[PDB]
Paper text:
HGbRL from M. infernorum is a putative globin-coupled sensor of 274 residues, consisting of an N-terminal globin domain and a C-terminal Roadblock/LC7 domain. N-HGbRL consists of seven α-helices, helices A–H, lacks helix D and forms a dimer. It displays a typical bacterial globin fold except for a very untypical feature — its helices E and F unexpectedly fuse into an elongated helix. In other words, both the proximal and distal sites of a single globin fold are constituted mainly by two separate subunits, representing the first ever site-swapping example in the globin family.
The structure of N-HGbRL was first solved in the open form in space group C2, with two subunits in the asymmetric unit. In the distal site, an imidazole molecule from the Ni2+-affinity chromatography binds to the haem and the highly conserved Tyr28(B10), which also coordinates a water molecule, W1. The distal site of N-HGbRL is lined by all hydrophobic residues (Phe27, Leu31, Phe42, Leu53, Val56, Val94 and Leu98) except for Tyr28(B10) and Lys52(E10). The A-ring propionate of the haem also hydrogen-bonds to the side chains of Arg80 and Tyr84, and the D-ring propionate to Lys43 N and the Tyr28-bound water W1. A ~ 25° bending of helix E results in a large shift of subunits B* between the two forms, creating a huge pocket of about 250 Å3 in the distal site of the open form that connects to several tunnels. The huge pocket of N-HGbRL’s open structure may be able to bind a comparatively large ligand. In the open form, interaction between subunits B* from two adjacent asymmetric units, Arg39(C5) from one asymmetric unit and Glu47 from the other, causes loop CE to shift relative to that of subunit A*. When comparing their highly conserved Gln(E7)–Leu(E15) regions, however, helix E of N-HGbRL’s open form is moved forwards by about a helical turn relative to that of HGbI, leading to a structural ‘frameshift’ of three residues. HGbI also has a smaller distal pocket which is connected to the solvent through several tunnels, but the distal pocket of the open form of N-HGbRL is readily accessible from the solvent through an opening. When a signalling ligand binds the haem in the closed form, it dislodges Lys52(E10) and pushes helix E outwards, inducing part of loop CE to fold into the extra turn of helix E of the open form.
Author numbering:
A (entry chain A): 1 to 136
B (entry chain B): 1 to 135
The structure:
Amino acid sequence: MTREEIKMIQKSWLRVIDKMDEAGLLFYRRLFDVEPKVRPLFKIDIEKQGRKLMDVLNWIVLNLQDIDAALDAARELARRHVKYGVKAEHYPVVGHTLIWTLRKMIGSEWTKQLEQLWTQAYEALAQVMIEEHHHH
Amino acid sequence: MTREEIKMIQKSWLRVIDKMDEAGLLFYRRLFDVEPKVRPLFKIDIEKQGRKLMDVLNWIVLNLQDIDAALDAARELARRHVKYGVKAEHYPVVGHTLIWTLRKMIGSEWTKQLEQLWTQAYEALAQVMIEEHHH
Ligand code: HEM
Ligand code: HEM
């Protein structure tokens, strides 16, 4: 997500934080109306329903911030690459060539599983870096 | 990824390091054979090719470890949910209900964009938690 997209989420969150008791009552009423079977799982103090819903929303937003922070190293790397003249379209050939090289060095003990893991790691990283390229 | 999968990555990585000079040479030779148009992007220094490929592989693996650590909070949360009696099948209805509540509360200021953002955030989180449930 973009810094502004995270900003939009945090604002909507602070909007609800104001009316937390109301939001809490609405959530559980709704959840137990549509899915009455999960009622017994919730052993919360009845006066804290608002607080407990707020804690869920808090958790999501705070964790979203932490993950965004964790992604910043990759965006940093991608910005240096923008400066090197690398473009989004160049990432596949590098990945294939990395994989080609590994498979050749690792030799006999190279597995389809290993190749899948290296591929997943590369594509996931390249996806975040590519997003950064498109911001430029 | 599981810890065991990350270790598999780490182990193959250490193997390449063992002959990093050769891996470097192989890599750049292949890249420029396959895609000569990108050759002008790279600084000319054949003797450093081992080091240069190593920076790349090191970055990938360490960053992979960093991201995996960043996911541990969601996984810890999910482990508590397992103890609470929660099942992977419960995640979609709770997500729908959470976003339904936000939409009702925010009222006229709600937008499709906001709804799509909360959806993306919830689904990405739930996907990590559900993976933990299935272990
Ligand atoms: C991404 C989704 C979810 C998030 C972020 C979330 C967050 C939280 C948080 C922060 C708590 C407070 C206790 C703790 O930290 O362990 C909690 C408790 C709880 N949640 Fe969730 N939750 C999620 C999904 C679900 C789902 C799908 C269910 C299914 C019914 C559920 C049921 C419960 C129950 C039963 C408790 C404990 C209530 C009690 O204290 O008795 N949660 N959740
Ligand atoms: C996920 C994929 C990639 C990773 C992890 C990666 C990693 C790195 C690292 C760690 C460096 C050292 C300098 C620095 O840290 O900024 C570097 C440099 C560099 N990379 Fe990448 N890179 C990736 C993709 C690419 C692609 C697609 C290209 C396209 C041609 C490329 C071309 C370059 C160039 C030209 C340099 C400057 C060093 C030199 O001139 O040899 N990289 N890369």
